Design an enzyme around this catalytic site. Structure first.
Site, short mmCIF file in Angstrom:
data_model
loop_
_atom_site.label_atom_id
_atom_site.label_comp_id
_atom_site.label_asym_id
_atom_site.label_seq_id
_atom_site.Cartn_x
_atom_site.Cartn_y
_atom_site.Cartn_z
N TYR A 1 -33.82 -14.69 -23.92
CA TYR A 1 -34.65 -13.85 -23.01
C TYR A 1 -33.90 -13.17 -21.74
O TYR A 1 -34.60 -12.69 -20.92
CB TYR A 1 -35.80 -14.90 -22.43
CG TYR A 1 -36.73 -15.10 -23.43
CD1 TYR A 1 -36.94 -16.31 -24.40
CD2 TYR A 1 -37.85 -14.25 -23.64
CE1 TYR A 1 -37.54 -16.30 -25.39
CE2 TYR A 1 -38.81 -14.12 -24.64
CZ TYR A 1 -38.59 -15.52 -25.39
OH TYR A 1 -39.53 -15.71 -26.34
N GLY B 1 -32.14 -10.46 -19.78
CA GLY B 1 -32.09 -8.99 -20.01
C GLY B 1 -33.26 -8.11 -20.63
O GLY B 1 -34.43 -8.85 -20.78
N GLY C 1 -35.24 -7.21 -23.79
CA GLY C 1 -36.46 -8.00 -24.42
C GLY C 1 -36.72 -9.42 -24.34
O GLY C 1 -36.11 -9.96 -23.61
N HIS D 1 -38.80 -15.91 -16.01
CA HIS D 1 -38.82 -14.84 -15.11
C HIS D 1 -39.42 -13.46 -15.77
O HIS D 1 -40.17 -12.96 -15.10
CB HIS D 1 -37.52 -14.51 -14.96
CG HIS D 1 -37.08 -13.41 -13.83
ND1 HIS D 1 -36.54 -12.04 -14.42
CD2 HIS D 1 -37.30 -13.24 -12.46
CE1 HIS D 1 -36.43 -11.38 -13.28
NE2 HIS D 1 -36.79 -11.83 -12.31
N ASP D 2 -39.41 -13.50 -17.06
CA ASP D 2 -39.88 -12.43 -17.77
C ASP D 2 -41.56 -12.74 -17.71
O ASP D 2 -42.31 -11.83 -17.39
CB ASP D 2 -39.61 -12.62 -19.38
CG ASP D 2 -38.32 -11.93 -19.67
OD1 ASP D 2 -37.54 -11.54 -18.80
OD2 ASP D 2 -37.74 -11.94 -20.83
N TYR E 1 -42.61 -11.61 -14.20
CA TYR E 1 -43.09 -10.09 -14.08
C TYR E 1 -44.07 -9.63 -14.77
O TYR E 1 -44.87 -8.59 -14.52
CB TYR E 1 -41.63 -9.30 -14.58
CG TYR E 1 -40.32 -9.51 -13.60
CD1 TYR E 1 -40.24 -9.87 -12.43
CD2 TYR E 1 -39.21 -8.56 -14.08
CE1 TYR E 1 -39.21 -9.75 -11.70
CE2 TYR E 1 -38.18 -8.39 -13.64
CZ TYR E 1 -38.12 -8.81 -12.15
OH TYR E 1 -36.96 -8.80 -11.39
N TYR F 1 -37.18 -5.28 -2.19
CA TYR F 1 -37.72 -6.27 -1.32
C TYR F 1 -36.51 -6.73 -0.56
O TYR F 1 -35.46 -6.42 -0.73
CB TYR F 1 -38.48 -7.38 -2.14
CG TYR F 1 -37.42 -8.07 -3.20
CD1 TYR F 1 -36.43 -8.74 -2.65
CD2 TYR F 1 -37.42 -7.74 -4.45
CE1 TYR F 1 -35.41 -9.48 -3.61
CE2 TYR F 1 -36.58 -8.31 -5.41
CZ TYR F 1 -35.53 -9.12 -5.05
OH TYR F 1 -34.65 -9.72 -5.98
N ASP G 1 -37.79 -13.46 -8.59
CA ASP G 1 -36.49 -13.25 -8.73
C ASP G 1 -35.60 -14.44 -7.87
O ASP G 1 -34.95 -15.00 -8.35
CB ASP G 1 -35.71 -12.15 -7.98
CG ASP G 1 -36.07 -10.61 -8.81
OD1 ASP G 1 -36.74 -10.76 -10.02
OD2 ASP G 1 -35.81 -9.73 -8.39
#
Length: 121
Positions: free
Chosen positions: A27, A29, A31, A47-48, A51, A64, A89
Site C-alpha cells: 500500500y 505509494g 496503488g 492512509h489510503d 484519503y 496545508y 498525513d
C-alpha cells in the site's frame, strides 16, 4: 500535498519518502490491493483509506500548514479539505515512526502480483 507529506515523513523518520516509502509493500505509494505486508504497510493502507474518505479533496496537490509543538505535529487551520488531508498525513507519519522497528528493506519495490488477499477500509 505529496511534497509536504514527503517532508513530514523525513522529519519524523529521518528516511527519504522517495524511495523508502514510495514503493513499499502493497500500500505505500501509487496503488493498493491485498494484505498489507507489515505494520509500515498497514500505515499506508490506513492512509489510503483516510484519503479515500475525502472524495472531493485533492490530497496530492492541495497544500496545508502545520507547526511543531515540542515534537508534536499540530495541523493549522486552512480549508476543511486541507485540515482533513493534514490529519491523514500526520497520522501516517506518526505511524511510520512508531513502526521503524520493523521496517524491512525487502519490501521496497514490492511486486504488484504478490499483493494477495483482500481488506476493506
Amino acid at each position: 500535498s505529496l511534497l509536504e507529506f514527503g517532508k513530514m515523513i523525513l522529519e519524523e523518520t529521518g528516511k527519504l519518502a522517495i524511495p523508502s516509502y514510495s514503493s513499499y509493500g502493497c500500500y505505500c505509494g501509487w496503488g493498493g490491493k491485498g494484505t498489507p505486508k507489515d505494520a509500515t504497510d498497514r500505515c499506508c493502507f490506513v492512509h489510503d483509506c483516510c484519503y479515500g474518505n475525502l472524495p472531493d479533496c485533492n490530497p496530492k496537490s492541495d497544500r496545508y500548514k502545520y507547526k511543531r509543538v515540542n515534537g508534536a505535529i499540530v495541523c493549522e487551520k486552512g480549508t476543511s479539505c486541507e485540515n482533513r488531508i493534514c490529519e491523514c498525513d500526520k497520522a501516517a507519519a506518526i505511524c511510520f515512526r512508531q513502526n521503524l522497528n520493523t521496517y524491512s528493506k525487502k519490501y521496497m519495490l514490492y511486486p504488484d502480483f504478490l499483493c494477495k488477499g483482500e481488506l476493506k477500509c
